[PDB]
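subagent[fold] <- orchestrator: predict structure for attached chain, return tokens only, no commentary.
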Amino acid sequence: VVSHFNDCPLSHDGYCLHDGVCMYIEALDKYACNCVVGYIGERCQYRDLKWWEL
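subagent[fold] -> orchestrator:
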């Protein structure tokens, strides 16, 4: 679908943990959260420690 792109609502890191990157997908009219690198769990809660303590 052709939609215009806007940002995520006020509770952007609401369900999406560790400051999760909430975005809209304009093409499909869906939402998602993208996770940062070195963060683990299905919900992206935790940090992988080993690279820090190197």
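orchestrator: received. Logging for downstream: The longest strand covers residues 21-25. The chain has one domain: 1-54.
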